[PDB]
Ligand binder design. Structure first.
Ligand SMILES: [K+]
Ligand SMILES: [K+]
Ligand SMILES: [Mg+2]
Ligand SMILES: [Mg+2]
Length: 135
RNA sequence: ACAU
DNA sequence: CGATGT
């Protein structure tokens, strides 16, 4: 119904899919960029969306913040809930880095706790998520 | 079909 | 138009 403005919003940006993947987290209210991941040479949209949420979890936990996280990705929200990123991306030398980060993100989820609500950004009602890459 |  | 996903 209503945007929870006291929140973190995340989004992925890519050059190709699969292709170069980056992501960032912003203050939903102000747009302030809170974290930005260095571009990853090959990954998928959904792996980036997943990494963005998990990074947001780690970011908020380190800062003792109970803010929720918004993502517009049905897929990544489910993957985080499951603690399992069910990507189809081939594992090879070229995809080694993104798969390493995804593996490590799952591992973090399986060794830490959090109460952070992970919320679906309702793009059809509210427009583009505040972390959008204007892409 | 829905979400990217 | 193509790809990633439930
Ligand atoms: K975009
Ligand atoms: K499809
Ligand atoms: Mg997105
Ligand atoms: Mg976007």
């Amino acid at each position: 119904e209503e945007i929870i403005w006291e929140s973190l919003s995340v989004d992925v940006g890519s050059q190709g899919n699969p292709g170069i993947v980056e992501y960032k987290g912003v203050d939903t209210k102000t747009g302030e960029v809170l974290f930005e991941r260095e571009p990853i040479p090959i990954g998928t949209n959904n792996m980036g969306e997943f990494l963005a949420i998990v990074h947001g979890l780690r970011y908020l936990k380190e800062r003792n913040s109970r803010k929720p996280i918004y993502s517009d990705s049905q897929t990544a929200i489910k993957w985080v809930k499951d603690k399992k990123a069910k990507s189809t991306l081939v594992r090879n030398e070229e995809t080694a880095l993104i798969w390493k980060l995804v593996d490590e993100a799952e591992e973090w989820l399986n060794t830490h706790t959090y109460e952070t609500p992970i919320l679906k950004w309702q793009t059809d009602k509210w427009g583009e998520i505040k972390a959008d890459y204007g892409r």
